[PDB]
């Protein structure tokens, strides 16, 4: 019931794994230490192995016994006969660092109990000592423990440990001298300038009123990517089903109208363009659609990670009308619901290192404003999706509100926020007959 908590079987398993593989010792040398172990024979074995890996790389069965022999230690450290059992056991695979980490943790635990014993000792043993000379000692010891637990990554880093990563990214980008696109491209040249391409660890938002084009624009982004991104994409159509999506997308990629598709009065050239774009999409095999209705961020994360390990690793994610996302815990408070959603999506993007398009709606506030250009406040709910987002870009198409516009066939992509870049107003030509946005070779902005 009561004992020093220690695991000693996985310990020997690590020992034999190091024996049968003289390559991966540095990675466990990061974690495991000679005094980390519990019993002294294992400690002798590991520290001898370490002294040898300084000098003698080959250490499996006999170099160990020889180095142990030259200084006269056989049968005082167990035995070569006993060592046979260690090399015999654990022919296991690269599942070694797990054992290493967990036993390293057990060592930390054992040390904690040791120091609690020391504190109890110094407590019941006064030695003519005061609370002020005692609690301060206790604080200093526990401080030395928690401060130094062989942990480097999670803690606040000195600047030289940050500039290494910064210069590393700069070398990753200079070592490939290429265009002014530091991530995913869209297919649109007027927008890649104000974005440097959809960057790879952000939460993009694509918001606009309902009849405006945001699902259309998003599908255009993803299909263009998947035509120039040899790497998967995802599409979560929580609103409409896959069979509307793909129809819209064939119309987009082939510049034929949607009625002609669904109803079936299309001409030989139309049939040909369809044939070609199909036979393209079926080769690259990027697009993966999920027409699930009421998802949660957990389901999103799982269904994205499933791809991201087996189909390689992914290039972007699209999410239609995230206000349908749910989390039943926060089912009463809608505001905190959306905040949890958005935080989880940003976390996902930082996890998988991809962008996360996340379509959203706007509120019926701009209608009584007479300009109609959507400002960042005009987001459907919670105000936090303008806070966790590293990019927002609204859509406004003046022909909807003004029949007397000189701005018809024209949609402008109001960048309404961008942390790592400028704001602006891109413009593009709308042709919803085949559900596409296209570039605008015309006046500047």
Give dist(CA 395, CA 415) in Å, integer: 9
Total residues contacting its own copies by CB under 8 A comes to 158
CB of 216 to Mg ion, least distance (A): 8
User: Residue 215, interface with Mg ion (CB under 5 A)?
Assistant: yes
From candidates 268, 332, 406, 444, binder to its own copies by CB under 8 A: 332
The 436-438 sheet, strands edge to edge: 358-360, 204-207, 391-393, 411-418, 424-431, 436-438
- Report the residue number, 132 or 268, with the smaller CB distance to its own copies: 132
CB of 136 to Mg ion, least distance (A): 35
Q: Quick one: tokens of 249?
A: 């997308």
Orientation of helix 80-88 relative to helix 62-70, angle to 10°: 150
CB 217 within 8 A of CB 396: no
CB of 75 to its own copies, least distance (A): 12
H helix intervals, 202-257: 214-228, 242-254
User: Residue 350, interface with its own copies (CB under 8 A)?
Assistant: yes
Total residues contacting Mg ion by CB under 5 A comes to 2
410 binds, among its own copies, Mg ion, none (CB under 5 to 8 A by kind): none
Instruction: Consult the annotation and say whether 214 binds a ligand.
Output: yes
- Report the residue number, 96 or 428, with the smaller CB distance to Mg ion: 428
- Report the residue number, 251 or 428, with the smaller CB distance to its own copies: 251
Give dist(CA 266, CA 398) in Å, integer: 31
CB of 116 to its own copies, least distance (A): 4
Instruction: Consult the annotation and say whether 211 binds a ligand.
Output: yes
From candidates 43, 247, 429, 431, binder to its own copies by CB under 8 A: 247
Nearest to 152 by CA among 162, 143, 139, 163: 162
Site string for Mg ion, 220-249 (x = CB under 5 A): -------------------x----------
Phi, psi of 235 (to 5 degrees): -150, 115
Q: Which helix (H) or strand (E) holds 112?
A: helix 97-124
Q: Angle at Cα 142 formed by Cα 140 and Cα 145, nearest 5°?
A: 110
Nearest to 226 by CA among 184, 178, 166: 184
Among 37-45, 241-249, 405-413, 437-445, the segment contacting its own copies (CB under 8 A) = 241-249
CB of 321 to Mg ion, least distance (A): 5
Is 126 exposed, middle or buried, given 0-12, 13-18 or 19+ CB atoms closer than 10 A? exposed
User: Residue 22, interface with its own copies (CB under 8 A)?
Assistant: yes
Give dist(CA 107, CA 36) in Å, integer: 5
CB 424 within 8 A of CB 445: yes
User: Residue 132, interface with its own copies (CB under 8 A)?
Assistant: yes
Contacts of 11 (CB under 8 A, 6+ apart): 37, 38, 42, 99, 103
User: Residue 340, interface with its own copies (CB under 8 A)?
Assistant: no
Instruction: Consult the annotation and say whether 360 binds a ligand.
Output: no
- Report the residue number, 179 or 406, with the smaller CB distance to its own copies: 179
247 binds, among Mg ion, its own copies, none (CB under 5 to 8 A by kind): its own copies
Which residue bears the tokens 């209608």? Answer: 367
- Among positions 137-196, residues that touch its own copies (CB under 8 A) are 138-139, 142-143, 145-147, 149, 154-160, 162-163, 165-167, 169-170, 173-174, 177, 180, 182, 196
258 binds, among Mg ion, its own copies, none (CB under 5 to 8 A by kind): its own copies
From candidates 39, 73, 76, 92, binder to its own copies by CB under 8 A: 92
From candidates 33, 34, 77, 336, binder to its own copies by CB under 8 A: 336
Which residue(s) pair with 327 in the sheet?
A: none
- Report the residue number, 308 or 428, with the smaller CB distance to its own copies: 308
- Among positions 52-91, residues that touch its own copies (CB under 8 A) are 56, 58-63, 65-66, 69, 80
CB 405 within 8 A of CB 425: no
Give dist(CA 335, CA 315) in Å, integer: 30
State the binding site for ATP.
Answer: 211, 214-215, 419
- Binding residue ranges: 211, 214-215, 419
Contact footprint for Mg ion (CB under 5 A): 215, 239
């Amino acid at each position: 019931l009561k004992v020093p908590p220690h695991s000693i079987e996985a310990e020997q398993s690590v020992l034999g794994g190091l024996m049968l593989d003289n390559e991966r010792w540095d990675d466990v040398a990061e974690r495991v230490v000679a005094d980390d172990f519990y019993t002294r024979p294992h400690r002798h074995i590991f520290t001898e192995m370490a002294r040898l890996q300084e000098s003698g790389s080959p250490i499996d069965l006999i170099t160990l016994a020889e180095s142990l022999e030259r200084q006269g230690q056989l049968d005082s450290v167990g035995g070569f006969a006993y060592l046979a059992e260690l090399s015999k056991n654990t022919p296991s695979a690269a599942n070694i660092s797990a054992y290493a980490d967990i036993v390293r943790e057990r060592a930390v635990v054992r040390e904690m109990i040791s120091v609690a014993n020391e504190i109890a000792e110094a407590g019941f043993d006064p030695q003519g000592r005061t609370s002020e000379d005692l609690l301060d000692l206790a604080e200093s010891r526990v401080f030395k423990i928690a401060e130094s637990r062989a942990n480097k990554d999670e803690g606040p880093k000195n600047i030289a440990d940050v500039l290494d990563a910064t210069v590393a990214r700069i070398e990753q980008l200079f070592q490939q001298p290429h265009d002014g696109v530091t991530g995913v491209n869209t297919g649109y040249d007027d927008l890649n300038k104000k974005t440097a391409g959809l960057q790879p660890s952000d939460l993009i938002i694509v918001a606009a009123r309902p009849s405006m084009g945001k699902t259309t624009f998003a599908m255009n982004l993803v299909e263009n990517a998947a035509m120039l991104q040899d790497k998967p994409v995802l599409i979560f159509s929580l609103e409409m089903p896959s069979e509307q999506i793909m129809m819209r997308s064939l119309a987009s990629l082939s510049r034929v109208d949607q009625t002609k598709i669904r109803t079936g009065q299309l001409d030989d050239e139309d049939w040909a363009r369809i044939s070609g774009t199909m036979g393209i999409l079926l080769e690259k095999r990027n697009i993966y659609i999920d027409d699930s209705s009421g998802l949660t961020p957990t389901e999103v994360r799982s269904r994205a990670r499933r791809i991201a390990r087996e189909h390689g690793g992914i290039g972007l994610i699209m999410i239609d009308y995230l206000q349908l996302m749910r989390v039943p815990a926060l089912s009463d408070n809608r505001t905190l619901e959306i905040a949890e959603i958005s935080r989880s999506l940003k976390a996902l993007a930082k996890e998988l290192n991809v962008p996360v398009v996340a379509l959203s709606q706007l509120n019926r506030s701009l209608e009584q404003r007479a300009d109609k250009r959507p400002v960042n406040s005009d987001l459907r709910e919670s105000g936090s999706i303008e806070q966790d987002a590293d990019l927002i870009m609204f859509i406004y198409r003046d022909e909807v509100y003004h029949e007397n516009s000189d701005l018809k066939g024209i949609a402008e992509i109001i960048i309404g926020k961008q942390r790592n870049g400028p704001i602006g107003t891109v413009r593009l030509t709308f042709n919803g007959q085949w559900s596409r946005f296209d570039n605008y070779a015309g006046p500047q902005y």
